[PDB]
Amino acid sequence: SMSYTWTGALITPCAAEESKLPNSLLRHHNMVYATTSRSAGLRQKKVTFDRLQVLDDHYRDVLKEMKAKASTVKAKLLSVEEACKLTPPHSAKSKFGYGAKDVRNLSSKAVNHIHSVWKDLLEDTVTPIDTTIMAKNEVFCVQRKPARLIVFPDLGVRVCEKMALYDVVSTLPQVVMGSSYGFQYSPGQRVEFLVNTWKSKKNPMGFSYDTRCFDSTVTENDIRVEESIYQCCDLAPEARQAIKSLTERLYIGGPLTNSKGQNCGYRRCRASGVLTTSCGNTLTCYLKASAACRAAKLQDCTMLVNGDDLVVICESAGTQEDAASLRVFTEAMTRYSAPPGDPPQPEYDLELITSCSSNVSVAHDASGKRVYYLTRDPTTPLARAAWETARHTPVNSWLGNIIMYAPTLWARMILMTHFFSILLAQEQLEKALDCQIYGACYSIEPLDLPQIIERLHGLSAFSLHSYSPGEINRVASCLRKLGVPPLRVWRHRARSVRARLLSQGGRAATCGKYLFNWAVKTKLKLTPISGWFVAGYSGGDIYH
Ligand SMILES: N#CCc1ccc(O)cc1
């Protein structure tokens, strides 16, 4: 079938959308843009086509193996009150007379509607359920993406998703997929696994595989396969009917209504904005890629999967033979309707592989031992940091980034420095901020960072020191490219910030001591002082 059919009604904005900044961070303000509904038509072209899927024996053996593991999972229905509490405070309000706040407070009005939306699921496994369709506002840097398309149901139904399926998507993927399930790894757990599976090969070769617009490629068959997988769990029979209902009425497809209540058409592929999207896309990607490995007679594959993002580390068979096996791999994905975006490439250096927007690189600790840590090109982080300082958004990527990328050259010299500067100047150190980790919202007190980082990356994150030539040049380049003060200017800014931090005592002093010891010249000596990197919930409307 067609991934989407369109009526012609436009995808419409909710309010005024900014596509530009209105400066101590970066001078090239004209290089940073946000996507808007003005690019919707273009994204619409990219994401719509007919899907021709052809399964094979490898697909069925992997599935049968996945089903066997899934059958050992037992999972419980969630109550209204547990599901309510998981709803973020600023989730989109219902069109039936209530908002997230009412939900979170167990207002009998929201809860009654939730009850009646559940009953209807139990009674009706057929009528497609309505979705809103919207163009996302995401900041990027020049060199231009069309907005991505977010699709999601009413709050009422979201709460019910949590009821039927929160336990399933939190628990199953790890069990079905073992060490291949990416969202079980904190950043240092993730480097840990990758580096060890790399060294475990005799003659290693790795590749990432970018699937072209994954959500579009996910077929209605795919989503029932996914369901059948969920169905193998030992489920309470009321969860069983809700799950059949939700997949048939929402996950499989349905009508697309825009911000003004007009009909834009009909989706027959993955909604980005539903509970099962991450889990589903991971299962579906792991399944299809596991089979593509078997087709291409790739030897001794270890895989790592995070939604549509896929890495494979395996035994090389020579460079010709590799390049070819990759072409066979690609051909099979394509048959399974997960065609290529960038055509995949063999790498023989773990550092050059990019997966989950990230790569392994190596630094040294105080003692001089070698430490592997996880980094990325800092462009999008810096851009969005410049955006976030300019226009006050309720979302704070800088902080997530500091948390995910705390050992890096750039998060430490640039992000830590800049933002502790804003917070000191604004007297807002003590204020918690919401940030997103694997699609769940957490409230985080910026003063806790020292502990947080020690816990997630160890003590060495405060003293890594001979970063690699490739890393340094990427960061230095990105800086010139974007118009950001070079690294030596951040050193002098950090000495200033550290000092102000220290004079305040308490936890601000701890932040200054630990976060900024790289900047001093004579080092102080640094002694010691969750449910976070467990699952993927992006699109999933989850709060903690
Ligand atoms: N750190 C980390 C992993 C990660 C980063 C960004 C993203 O969209 C998904 C996963």
Residue numbers in the entry: 1 to 22, 28 to 148, 154 to 539, 548 to 562
The authors write:
In this study, we presented a ligand-observed MS approach for high-throughput screen of a 384-member fragment library as well as reliable estimation of binding affinity of each fragment hit. Similar to other nucleotide polymerases, the domain distribution of apo HCV NS5B polymerase bears an anatomical resemblance to a right hand with subdomains representing the fingers, thumb and palm. The proposed discovery pipeline combining our MS-based approach and other biophysical techniques resulted in identification and validation of ten new fragments bound to two distinctive domains of NS5B, among which five were successfully translated to X-ray structures of fragment-bound complexes valuable for structure-based design of potent inhibitors.
To characterize the binding modes of the fragments studied, they were soaked in NS5B crystals to obtain the protein complex X-ray structures. Inspection of the crystal structures indicated that fragments 114, 204, 117, and 328 all bound at the palm I allosteric domain, while fragment 162 bound at the thumb region. Fragments 114 and 204 showed higher binding affinity than the others in the previous MS-based validation assay. The X-ray structure of NS5B in complex with 114 revealed that its cyano group engages deep in a small hydrophobic pocket, where it forms hydrophobic interactions with Met414 and Tyr415. Moreover, the interaction could be enhanced by a π-π conjugate between its benzene ring and Tyr448. The measured binding degrees of fragments 114 and 130 were close to the theoretical value. In this study, four fragment hits and the designed ligands all bound in the palm I pocket, where an overwhelming majority of NS5B inhibitors were also found to bind Specifically, Met414, Cys366 and Tyr448 in the palm domain of NS5B have been documented to be the “hot spots” for binding of high-potency inhibitors3854 and they were also found to be the dominant sites for fragment binding in our study.
